[PDB]
Amino acid sequence: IEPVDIEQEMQRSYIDYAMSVIVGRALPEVRDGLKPVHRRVLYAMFDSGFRPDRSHAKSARSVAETMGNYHPHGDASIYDSLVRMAQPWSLRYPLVDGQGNFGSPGNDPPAAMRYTEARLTPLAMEMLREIDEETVDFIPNYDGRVQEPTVLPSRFPNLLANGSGGIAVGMATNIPPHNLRELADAVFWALENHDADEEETLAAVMGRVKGPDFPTAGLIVGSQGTADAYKTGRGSIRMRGVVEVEEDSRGRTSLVITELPYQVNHDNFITSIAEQVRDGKLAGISNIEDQSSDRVGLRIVIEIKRDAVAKVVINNLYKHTQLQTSFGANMLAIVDGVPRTLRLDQLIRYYVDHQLDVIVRRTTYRLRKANERAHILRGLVKALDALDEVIALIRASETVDIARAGLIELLDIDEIQAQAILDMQLRRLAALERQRIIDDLAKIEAEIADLEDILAKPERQRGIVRDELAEIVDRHGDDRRTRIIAI
Amino acid sequence: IEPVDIEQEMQRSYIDYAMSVIVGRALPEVRDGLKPVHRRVLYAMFDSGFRPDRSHAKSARSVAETMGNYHPHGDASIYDSLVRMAQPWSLRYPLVDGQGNFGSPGNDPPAAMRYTEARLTPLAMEMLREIDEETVDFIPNYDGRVQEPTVLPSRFPNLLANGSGGIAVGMATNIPPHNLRELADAVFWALENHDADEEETLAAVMGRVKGPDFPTAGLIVGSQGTADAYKTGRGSIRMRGVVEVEEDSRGRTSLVITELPYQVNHDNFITSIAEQVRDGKLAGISNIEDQSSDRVGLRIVIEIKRDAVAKVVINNLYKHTQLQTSFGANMLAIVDGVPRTLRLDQLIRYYVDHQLDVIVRRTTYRLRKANERAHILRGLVKALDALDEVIALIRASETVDIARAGLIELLDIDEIQAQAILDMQLRRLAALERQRIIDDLAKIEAEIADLEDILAKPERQRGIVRDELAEIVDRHGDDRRTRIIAI
Amino acid sequence: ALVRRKGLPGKLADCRSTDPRKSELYVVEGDSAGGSAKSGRDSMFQAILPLRGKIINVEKARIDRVLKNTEVQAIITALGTGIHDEFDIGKLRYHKIVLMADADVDGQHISTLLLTLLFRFMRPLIENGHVFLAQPPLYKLKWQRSDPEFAYSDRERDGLLEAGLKAGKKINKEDGIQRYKGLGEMDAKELWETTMDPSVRVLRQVTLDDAAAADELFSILMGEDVDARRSFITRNAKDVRFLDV
Amino acid sequence: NALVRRKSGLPGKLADCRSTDPRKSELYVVEGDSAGGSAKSGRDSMFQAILPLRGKIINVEKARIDRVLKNTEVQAIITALGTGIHDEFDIGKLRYHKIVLMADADVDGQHISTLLLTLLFRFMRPLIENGHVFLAQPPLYKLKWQRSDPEFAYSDRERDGLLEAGLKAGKKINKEDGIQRYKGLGEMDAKELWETTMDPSVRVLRQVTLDDAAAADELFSILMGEDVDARRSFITRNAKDVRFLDV
DNA sequence: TCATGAATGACTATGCACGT
DNA sequence: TCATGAATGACTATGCACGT
Numbered sequence A, B: 001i002e003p004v005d006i007e008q009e010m011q012r013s014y015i016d017y018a019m020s021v022i023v024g025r026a027l028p029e030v031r032d033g034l035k036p037v038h039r040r041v042l043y044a045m046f047d048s049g050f051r052p053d054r055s056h057a058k059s060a061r062s063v064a065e066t067m068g069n070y071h072p073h074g075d076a077s078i079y080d081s082l083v084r085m086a087q088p089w090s091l092r093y094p095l096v097d098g099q100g101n102f103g104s105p106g107n108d109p110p111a112a113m114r115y116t117e118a119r120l121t122p123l124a125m126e127m128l129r130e131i132d133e134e135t136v137d138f139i140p141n142y143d144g145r146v147q148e149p150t151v152l153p154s155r156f157p158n159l160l161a162n163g164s165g166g167i168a169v170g171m172a173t174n175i176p177p178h179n180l181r182e183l184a185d186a187v188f189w190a191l192e193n194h195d196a197d198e199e200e201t202l203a204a205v206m207g208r209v210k211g212p213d214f215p216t217a218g219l220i221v222g223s224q225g226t227a228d229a230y231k232t233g234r235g236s237i238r239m240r241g242v243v244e245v246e247e248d249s250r251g252r253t254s255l256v257i258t259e260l261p262y263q264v265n266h267d268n269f270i271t272s273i274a275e276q277v278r279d280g281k282l283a284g285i286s287n288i289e290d291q292s293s294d295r296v297g298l299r300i301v302i303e304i305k306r307d308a309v310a311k312v313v314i315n316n317l318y319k320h321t322q323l324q325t326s327f328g329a330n331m332l333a334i335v336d337g338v339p340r341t342l343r344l345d346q347l348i349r350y351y352v353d354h355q356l357d358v359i360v361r362r363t364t365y366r367l368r369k370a371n372e373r374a375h376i377l378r379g380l381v382k383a384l385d386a387l388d389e390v391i392a393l394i395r396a397s398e399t400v401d402i403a404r405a406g407l408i409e410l411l412d413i414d415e416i417q418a419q420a421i422l423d424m425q426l427r428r429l430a431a432l433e434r435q436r437i438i439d440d441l442a443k444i445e446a447e448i449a450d451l452e453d454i455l456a457k458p459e460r461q462r463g464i465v466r467d468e469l470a471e472i473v474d475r476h477g478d479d480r481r482t483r484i485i486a487i
Numbered sequence C: 001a002l003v004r005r006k007g008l009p010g011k012l013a014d015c016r017s018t019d020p021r022k023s024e025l026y027v028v029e030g031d032s033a034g035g036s037a038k039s040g041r042d043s044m045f046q047a048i049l050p051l052r053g054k055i056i057n058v059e060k061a062r063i064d065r066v067l068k069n070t071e072v073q074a075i076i077t078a079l080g081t082g083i084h085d086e087f088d089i090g091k092l093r094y095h096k097i098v099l100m101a102d103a104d105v106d107g108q109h110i111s112t113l114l115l116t117l118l119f120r121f122m123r124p125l126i127e128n129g130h131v132f133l134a135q136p137p138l139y140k141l142k143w144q145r146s147d148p149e150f151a152y153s154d155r156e157r158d159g160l161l162e163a164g165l166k167a168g169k170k171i172n173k174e175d176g177i178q179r180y181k182g183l184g185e186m187d188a189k190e191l192w193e194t195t196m197d198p199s200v201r202v203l204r205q206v207t208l209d210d211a212a213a214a215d216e217l218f219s220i221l222m223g224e225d226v227d228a229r230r231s232f233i234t235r236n237a238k239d240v241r242f243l244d245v
Numbered sequence D: 001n002a003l004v005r006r007k008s009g010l011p012g013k014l015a016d017c018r019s020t021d022p023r024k025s026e027l028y029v030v031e032g033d034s035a036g037g038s039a040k041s042g043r044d045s046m047f048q049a050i051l052p053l054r055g056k057i058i059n060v061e062k063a064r065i066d067r068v069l070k071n072t073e074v075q076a077i078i079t080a081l082g083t084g085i086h087d088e089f090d091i092g093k094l095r096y097h098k099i100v101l102m103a104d105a106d107v108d109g110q111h112i113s114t115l116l117l118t119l120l121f122r123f124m125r126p127l128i129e130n131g132h133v134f135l136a137q138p139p140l141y142k143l144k145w146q147r148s149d150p151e152f153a154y155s156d157r158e159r160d161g162l163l164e165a166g167l168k169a170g171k172k173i174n175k176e177d178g179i180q181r182y183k184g185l186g187e188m189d190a191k192e193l194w195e196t197t198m199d200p201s202v203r204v205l206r207q208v209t210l211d212d213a214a215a216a217d218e219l220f221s222i223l224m225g226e227d228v229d230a231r232r233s234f235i236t237r238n239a240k241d242v243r244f245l246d247v
Numbered sequence E, F: 001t002c003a004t005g006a007a008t009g010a011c012t013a014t015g016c017a018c019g020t
């Protein structure tokens, strides 16, 4: 029996827990804004072909595929993570197209795994765009059977767009969601002004990213908290729902709430007000009725007494309920395997850097493949010029090894190229078929030269990021939901 | 709004339920002895490649695949069905190779889906043998997306081997498991004496199938119930566990129970003995101790009082506990979509019929494919005999169609054969490869001759079933477990 | 008029209308379906009571055991009326009781169990036409450009598909026609536009003609006597298709 | 000294042993129902008892005492050990002289260990001081040789070593089935658990030692306490050097 | 004291037929 | 009354950090 001191054990074990939680579970990678479970689910769905170009697959298959290959944890909590990514009131830009009952903003829970189907959304397809062209580092999974991505290409700034909330050890993150078009403008400026320092860059980006854009709409009151979050990495953003005063035929007045601030449970909100009236604390209120439906959306009617002022009761609601509540912004994300609190310019810059890395790596991969194709084509072209000899050579060979060794000597060709000649179909010997090989070589060499030019010119690389992102924003960008007002 | 009478609604709805439960759920198909969920799990694992030639896949993947493609029901009960097929105390011949905690014969439950892995067993591979050679009818699944099998090839008599218990509506089945070697002998006799009437067949099969062979070993007392089951389709079979009296050093005697009858929960059994002493109904018993372990198996020690006779206490145990308990055999299975109670000769015959159907259908499929391959090979040989001419023709063609149309003209060829010539690689123009094509034609024509011979001779067909089954039994057959004794 | 909860079952999502005459109770199979139904309903006139699991057979089960059953209590308490001799239709809290179960056989089975409960404990609800059966959709035709159509049978699916194609409409061969295998697979919108919107929903009103003939049928199908049920099935299942011909 | 074991006033989840002698008795505190179920099957029921713990154990450093005592898992531990807590601690009433904490080799198992050790150090410290607390080291790998008996490895290094030696010895492994990797106790069956963590002739146990009580107290309060700031600075300070604690 | 969300599944009740 | 076995998932408690 080996002895171990309790201090050594405690320190070693808890640090090991704290670190993996920080860098491997609870906090988003700055580059794609994803936690490991999110990334593994999406790639699992992606690799399984559960894409918007095909019908929704049973969500159990996505969970099972994630479990068996990438995420060595329980099916239940994995399904919860998948579900959340399909809720329009949770994610500003849903990554999962959910079919069935995925719950509500209230206490209505999502249906069980068996009842729901799911597939990736178009934007999630941009998260994974060209992941198979060595655009991101892959590592072996939890048992080494297969490979998994360390990070996704993330061809749109998902961290800032969808935000992130996470409780780790010793620290936590709480990044709000933002409008894609505004983020795009910030990225476009960052690309054009690639030499601008942090001071200038922060000023530019803050001018374009006016503030967070919550999926639940509502209101942002004030500007200081937003500024603090972007300049410090921490700030308190005051959120409000929308209230519209209605009058009655009798002359009675009622407050109609049609929006609530981000992450306010609708049923808890109604129950809170109810409890805050049944025993006083919100006098002036006469009746609370939830006239909500799938067709009219949120609609909480607050009938008030004749001897009551509308704004007084509204101000009381702001004070004593989550009709007005603040978002505790804390811009914490993993950067190069280290947790870091980031300014807005840093968040933009780190993402732009990732995009450039993606585009260069993609270009490198395409350039390598282009050369391989060109290499073999050159081999075929040589065979065609001496086709009479090549065929006679192969025919007179007792084996294919003899033929291959001969081809190498005949045409002064590599073994890979000679292998391609041998694998050539009789189809490819037709007049027009011989011609396409020639043209294809001419086609590729132009492509090779183009790719080389891209790698040689940072300007083109930045231009590609801009143009490709612009295409995404034009297609998948939407209007602002949260309205920003002054004090 | 349409009116409907309650009698009409009740009768239609309940009958529709009863008929689906009877034919689609609770009761086994006579040909493979499988219920729908069993068949769908197994084929899901099979198509997914979860076979013995690969490591165990996470069981969640088997559940999800079954659920998503074939079985429109819940993940939980499907997992339970998969688990049961992996338990050596449930199935006489397990069809699922389980890895992890799959529970015990007692109250210890199986581990959750997340913790376990699973793949098909070798015998289960015999259930599915050559299913992809059109040996069984396929139908569209529950949404028509994919095809599923109506029945498995079942290359060993699985209904009798593993038995079946099912509660339907208006009826229930309870077929005990049997020894594979004994079933095989019956099948062999049925094959040899293929014209024997039912009386002779029942006599012959009853002589070879000595009785049920339970995975839990134990004893069968008497012969009447077994005979009734085989002759009538209904019978009460008395089972017993194994008791071994031990004399202690100090002088006391104790009963050691090492086996229990089929489907007797160990923990319930101990609790039952205990509780019938707590009240006081099994006097003579002094102490109950469960010395069972993973290494010695079941071992329940019942120390008896000194003024007590061991045989008396054992007989009291037989009467008042499940140490002796009856198996209510009810040989009910689905035959041609109809529920039927079957004699033992009928069960054997129906299985043999299914096997002959499988082999004939397999032969037909192989003959069709063999003809196709020969058809193309005949084309290839013609090309080789006139090889110089073939190439020159393809060269001068503006398209491949002109080259094709010419090949038809040159060698009097189909479009398939000419297309096959077109798809030919230069690899096969080497000497040995040309000879390989020649020999391959000779080989197929020899195989075609063999296949034609099989279809024309029932004798060979019966021979195939016998020999193939014999190979399966020699490899996967085991000793008898349940001992048969007289009164 | 009767008070709605804002002393009733916890599972009950009651309506807002205080008038039973205008009120409706959707008795739903499953938490999932009941959950989405609660979202797609008209909260003014429509209340939801989800029922979990197979309902207890009141024909077989002893009376006291039925009263212990949480799901039966939920129904009896929600309907407001008593049971048997203590039944009072004056306390009926919903003049429309819609049973909504899956189109599959287990949904049909649950219907027979609920109908057995009603016929044995609260027969006047059937006699006075307060009991209805919702017919869920089976298919959803998702046209590329046109609004989606719902089909309640294989025939209707074939017809609507034919008409649409003939009219020049087109469908994806991947997404295509979504097939519903249960209410649980539907979202709130789909349920509203097929089973709960009073302007398009397909309800069937349960009528009771011969009480004595109904009584014996219930006793046969739902009773403890297996033999009688077995012979009845083997006798009549052969001709179940030809009941409405 | 002897005490009665439950057989048809102790926790329902407890699978007690048969031996009435605490000096010879052992309590395996197991992470999870699955693992606890397998342990219950692979154990030696004579001397080894199983108490499965479900979910993360409540932090007795953060939570107030009344809430800790209402926690079902803590109650199970306190009741199973038989000893009281704090001032009412009486080692004479200890029902097991070996308390084996058996958690997953993974990160969450380590976390549970610290929570259990926190409970013990705060409520029942003498159990640690007197060497009644042990840590079971689960296997990580199972090498399945084609013809030879399978081997277990408790580290990546040992896996590499046994693989090399076996291959050098002429043995062979399937490159498909091959080396099974355990991701937790729940993935193991009864036999595997016996032959790696419960067989006293093969198991790898670590005995928890307590040297400096004052230093331990401080470390416990820092890592487990309510003060986040102290914990954050400690982690950022010392996580850099965790690899080099035993070099 | 409550919410967040990514981690660490057993229990609970019925239908159905048949034999204790 | 209980067991059999395929059918019809929500509720329950902790860690972790942070803000009202």
Ligand SMILES: COc1c(N2C[C@@H]3CCCN[C@@H]3C2)c(F)cc2c(=O)c(C(=O)O)cn(C3CC3)c12
Pocket (backbone or CB within 6 Å): A074, A075, A076, A077, D054, D055, D056, D072, D073, E008, E009, F012, F013
């Ligand atoms: C049995 O642990 C859990 C509890 N219980 C823990 C407590 C102590 C024992 C008595 N019950 C309470 C509630 C719970 F309430 C929820 C979950 C849960 O959701 C979950 C998951 O995969 O999502 C996994 N587990 C298990 C991995 C432990 C849960």
Ligand SMILES: COc1c(N2C[C@@H]3CCCN[C@@H]3C2)c(F)cc2c(=O)c(C(=O)O)cn(C3CC3)c12
Pocket (backbone or CB within 6 Å): B074, B075, B076, B077, C052, C053, C054, C070, C071, E012, E013, F008, F009
């Ligand atoms: C809520 O229904 C279930 C119960 N409850 C039903 C009762 C009424 C309400 C209060 N609870 C009791 C127990 C249960 F105990 C087990 C299961 C179950 O195992 C299961 C499965 O897929 O395996 C599926 N379901 C649901 C699909 C119906 C179960």
Ligand SMILES: [Mg+2]
Pocket (backbone or CB within 6 Å): A076, A077
């Ligand atoms: Mg959970």
Ligand SMILES: [Mg+2]
Pocket (backbone or CB within 6 Å): B076, B077
């Ligand atoms: Mg279940």
Ligand SMILES: [Mg+2]
Pocket (backbone or CB within 6 Å): C102, C104, C106, C107, C181, C182, C183
């Ligand atoms: Mg259904």
Ligand SMILES: [Mg+2]
Pocket (backbone or CB within 6 Å): D104, D106, D108, D109, D183, D184
């Ligand atoms: Mg673990």
